[PDB]
Design a protein around this nucleic acid. Structure first.
Ligand SMILES: [Cl-]
Ligand SMILES: [Cl-]
Ligand SMILES: [Mg+2]
Ligand SMILES: [Mg+2]
Ligand SMILES: [Mg+2]
Ligand SMILES: [Mg+2]
Ligand SMILES: [Mg+2]
Ligand SMILES: [Mg+2]
Ligand SMILES: [Mg+2]
Ligand SMILES: [Mg+2]
Ligand code: NA
Ligand code: NA
Ligand code: NA
Ligand code: NA
Ligand code: NA
Ligand SMILES: [Sr+2]
Ligand SMILES: [Sr+2]
Ligand SMILES: [Sr+2]
Ligand SMILES: [Sr+2]
Ligand SMILES: [Sr+2]
Ligand SMILES: [Sr+2]
Ligand SMILES: [Sr+2]
Ligand SMILES: [Sr+2]
Ligand SMILES: [Sr+2]
Lengths: 186, 140, 160, 154, 95
RNA sequence: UUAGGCGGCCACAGCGGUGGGGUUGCCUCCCGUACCCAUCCCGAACACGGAAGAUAAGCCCACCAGCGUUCCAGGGAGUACUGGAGUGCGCGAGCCUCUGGGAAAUCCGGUUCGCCGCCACC
RNA sequence: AGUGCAAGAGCAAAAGAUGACUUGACAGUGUUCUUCCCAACGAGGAACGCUGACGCGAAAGCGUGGUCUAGCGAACCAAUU
RNA sequence: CCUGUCAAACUCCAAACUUACAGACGCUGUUUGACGCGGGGAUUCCGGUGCGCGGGGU
């Protein structure tokens, strides 16, 4: 900017999207990366392999396409996060992937958060990712019980668009069950 | 447009810089929340050698806690022209500072792909005065 | 001391004051002479003194020659005449002298010289056509007080 | 295709230069070689610039020289058309001299020594202290000037 | 020299050019190399570890295996052969 | 890529500016604290739940060259400096001829307001 | 800016600062280079591994001291396990 | 703004040139065995001059 001596950051550091310190420490494993990234209305999970010109994505899963198998609920919560992670892991197994490491980017490693919930799903899917069980949320909160009891304090329905009043953490079980299913067009 | 541009009280800091404290309590009362210590840096010849040590205590009032506090705090002070910062901020007086800003300030306060607010979307001293004056008081 | 001792450029550039100390003050009074307010472009005639051989000129020889050059101009054009002379060189080169035979031979600082490649302008005066003769004489005195042979080249003004 | 001719001795001559000369199959003053004009072969002669005399010869001249100063890989036998004919892929000296210039083959390939051991220039050379442009006999020559040397060194 | 440590006369080669300051890209610091491959030796002033003795910059060795994640690179100092322990961070493929 | 995620090179990408863009799609700003989690004080941030409103921010698109930068042309300049040679010149410091290389500042006109890979998606 | 001290060099979602937890300044055996360019030479030094045990972190991973290059010493004798 | 100068321990720049590896050409080795490896015997560790680049010193 100023002159010849000025030092301009790597593009992805200006944009503040990649923490290269945590990135290098991540690549050292030699294993692929289970990229867990959020969004306000969504949650995604990619599988990254190192490449000559840039990272290669061999498997992914967006919370949006989590509907193609029967999903009427929202797409930015705990149940959605676990499921999206489970989906990608299943597609991941398909390509040949058998192990990966958790990449959460700039998201905080907060106990029982959505990213660990995403991690849990891909592991449940058959993948081998170094984890720490107790840092994960409990099964009920993953299912969506924390939100079901929130809707208990009704007086005003939680969901705008029709789904149902008290909601259904069963829809979670119904979909999870559908993924473990041998058939299902991945 | 006017909607995603109409300013608001982001935070209201109220602190009492001492130099050696016990005064914390008065704020915890008038504000309605908990205060926090205030350290320091560099050795000072006015018996202030201990670098990290309790000198004052501030309180960051946001949302309602701030407004309800301003209903009384504002009248207690005569506002002036020169009392305004270029980014539409003012301090008066015990001290009271109001940090004002336009709707999407989370863009510069978040962790993921944060960005600095463009000079255009940056609040103006004049545009700030008008906003405040538009709420039970005068100006210069 | 004789200029034979320092007239040639045979040592490395020794100018880094952040390492050198006891450096003697410059005998040179001033580089800006004449009417240091009027521009060089405000004058029809511009004459410089060109050094024909690359050398090192000590501040005492720099001052001496410049003095006897400007003394003439002041004498012939009056103390406030319509001219302005210059000396574009500053003595950056530090000099020493080992003053015990060759043991611990590094000399102590004795003065400052000014390096000048051949064909360079040691001086450059600015005057009007009528005074263009006292300038050519001021330089004829100036070149006698320095080591190399010099040339008086006229930069502007073919008036003759 | 140029013709290298050592005119300056080995004594005091920088080692890396005499080695290049040796690589160019020349180990004695007045010895000569026929070198192609390639990126590589060029770098060498340029390094040999000050201790040699070179240029491109006229075919006529190259034929008179091959006639006189050329020899087999091993032997005292004189190379003449009749000799050329029986050993080379040619019919006479001219045919040979032609191929060398057009850079179609080499002296070795045709069972001939790479060195044309010449005789001291008749009437002396123009000097070994200055280049050709300065009135000396070193460096690069003219297709006429090179012939003048070579022929004097029959 | 006035001292004979490893960093003697290493101001130039071991310094970063202004615009190259700060942390370096991980892509090369994790690069994979094969045995028999030719690699250029040059330290990355930004990377503190996995360095070889400064004196060996500009070399072009042949990878012959690894030690941990770091590499064992053969080179020929003058006439003497040496095996150098270095990380990919200071290595570049020939050609 | 009518706004996405991961990158490579790491300013050709910087600095600054102009203009354009989003009904059930996206990213956002946005809305809100029962929970996971959270602040030496603030649901600000982090974390969680959610769509009433908006495209002003950001972001994506198109464009500007004033600064910085990359490269190109002519100018400077085959100048400065230089590897090889010389019974070439100079009292000398030094210079010159041939040979093979060859800048820098700066001026002038251009170029640059990133290019590329993987996956995803009307 | 700071980073214990010469100088030179390295570092900004850190190598700097604050906070907490921790004591890896751990046990054991090596590879390579350095000391000693090339080119033989000891003590010392460093980078890079392996095995055991540990600290931390969600995990990758980081920790064989203080960001790197100075702070070091033979046999004999003595004391200690 | 304009104007005048510098740097062995300065550098936005930057050669010639030296240098690692590789290929090509050259030269060289496969009865003259190169390259390399092992062993025996040394001498030697007062150097000097020219040229280029030097550092100190009139
Ligand atoms: Cl994210
Ligand atoms: Cl090494
Ligand atoms: Mg023979
Ligand atoms: Mg005769
Ligand atoms: Mg003669
Ligand atoms: Mg140097
Ligand atoms: Mg707009
Ligand atoms: Mg002479
Ligand atoms: Mg004893
Ligand atoms: Mg003891
Ligand atoms: Na405290
Ligand atoms: Na870097
Ligand atoms: Na906008
Ligand atoms: Na040792
Ligand atoms: Na000796
Ligand atoms: Sr000298
Ligand atoms: Sr004596
Ligand atoms: Sr004179
Ligand atoms: Sr809020
Ligand atoms: Sr003489
Ligand atoms: Sr003399
Ligand atoms: Sr050219
Ligand atoms: Sr270290
Ligand atoms: Sr050298």
């Amino acid at each position: 900017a100023t002159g010849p001596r000025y030092k301009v950051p790597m593009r992805r550091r200006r944009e503040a999207r990649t923490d290269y310190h945590q990135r290098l420490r991540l690549l050292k494993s030699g294993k692929p990366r289970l990229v867990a990234r959020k969004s306000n209305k969504h949650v995604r999970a990619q599988l990254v392999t190192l490449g000559p010109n840039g990272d290669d994505t061999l498997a992914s899963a967006h919370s949006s396409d989590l509907a193609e198998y029967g999903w009427e609920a929202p797409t930015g919560n705990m149940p959605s996060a676990y499921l999206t992670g489970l989906l990608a892991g299943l597609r991941a197994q398909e390509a040949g992937v058998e192990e990966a490491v958790l990449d959460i980017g700039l998201n905080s490693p907060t106990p029982g958060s959505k990213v660990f919930a995403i991690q849990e799903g891909a592991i449940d899917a058959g993948l081998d990712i170094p984890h720490n069980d107790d840092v994960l949320a409990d099964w009920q909160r993953t299912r969506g019980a924390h939100i079901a009891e929130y809707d208990e304090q009704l007086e005003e329905p939680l969901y705008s668009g029709d789904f149902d009043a008290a909601d259904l953490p069963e829809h979670f079980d119904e979909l999870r069950e559908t993924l473990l299913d041998g058939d299902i067009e991945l | 447009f006017h909607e995603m541009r109409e300013p608001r009280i982001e935070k209201v800091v109220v602190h009492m810089g001492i130099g050696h404290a016990n005064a914390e309590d008065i704020l915890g009362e008038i504000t309605g929340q908990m205060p926090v210590r205030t350290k320091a840096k560099r050795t000072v010849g006015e018996f202030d050698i201990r670098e990290g040590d309790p000198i004052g205590a501030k309180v960051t009032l946001r949302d309602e806690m701030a407004e309800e506090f301003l209903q009384t705090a504002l009248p207690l002070a005569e506002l002036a022209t020169s009392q305004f910062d270029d980014t539409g901020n003012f301090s008066f007086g015990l001290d009271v500072t109001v940090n004002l800003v336009r709707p999407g300030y989370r863009v510069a306060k978040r962790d993921k792909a944060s960005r600095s607010i463009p000079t255009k979307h940056r609040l103006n001293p004049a545009d700030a005065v008008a906003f405040i004056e538009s709420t039970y008081d005068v100006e210069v | 001391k004789p200029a034979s001792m320092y007239r040639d450029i045979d040592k490395p550039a020794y100018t880094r004051r952040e390492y050198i100390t006891g450096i003697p003050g410059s005998k040179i009074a001033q580089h800006k002479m004449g009417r240091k307010q009027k521009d060089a472009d405000d004058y029809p005639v511009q004459i410089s003194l060109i050094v024909e051989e690359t050398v090192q000129l000590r501040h005492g020889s720099l001052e001496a020659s410049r003095l006897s050059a400007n003394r003439h101009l002041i004498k012939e054009l009056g103390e406030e005449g319509d001219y302005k002379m210059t000396l574009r060189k500053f003595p950056h080169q530090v000099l020493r002298e080992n003053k015990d035979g060759m043991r611990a031979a590094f000399g102590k600082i004795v003065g400052t010289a000014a390096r000048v490649q051949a064909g360079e302008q040691l001086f450059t005066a600015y005057c009007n056509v009528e005074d263009a003769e006292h300038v050519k004489e001021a330089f004829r005195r100036a070149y006698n007080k320095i080591t190399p042979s010099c040339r008086i080249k006229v930069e502007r003004g073919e008036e003759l | 295709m140029h013709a290298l001719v050592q005119l300056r001795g080995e004594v005091n001559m920088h080692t890396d230069i005499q080695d290049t000369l040796e690589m160019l199959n020349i180990h004695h003053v007045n010895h000569c070689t026929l070198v192609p004009e390639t990126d590589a072969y060029r770098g060498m002669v340029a390094k040999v610039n000050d201790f040699v005399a070179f240029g491109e010869p006229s075919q006529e001249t190259l034929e008179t020289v091959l006639a006189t100063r050329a020899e087999p890989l091993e032997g005292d036998a004189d190379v003449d058309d009749e000799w050329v004919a029986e050993h080379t892929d040619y019919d006479d000296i001219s045919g040979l001299a032609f191929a060398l210039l057009s850079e179609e083959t080499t002296l070795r390939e045709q069972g001939l020594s790479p060195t044309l051991r010449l005789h001291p220039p008749r009437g002396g050379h123009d000097g070994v202290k200055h280049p050709v442009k300065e009135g000396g006999q070193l460096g690069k020559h003219d297709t006429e000037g090179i012939d003048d040397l070579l022929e004097a060194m029959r | 020299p006035s001292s004979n440590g490893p960093l003697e006369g290493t101001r130039g080669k071991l310094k970063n050019k202004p615009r190259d300051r700060g942390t370096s890209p991980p892509q090369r610091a994790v690069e994979e190399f094969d045995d028999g491959e030719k690699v250029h030796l040059k330290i990355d002033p930004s990377v503190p570890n996995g360095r070889f003795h400064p004196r060996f910059d500009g070399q072009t060795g042949t990878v012959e295996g690894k030690q941990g994640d770091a590499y064992k690179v053969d080179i020929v100092d003058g006439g003497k052969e040496k095996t150098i322990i270095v990380t990919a961070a200071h290595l570049r493929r020939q050609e």
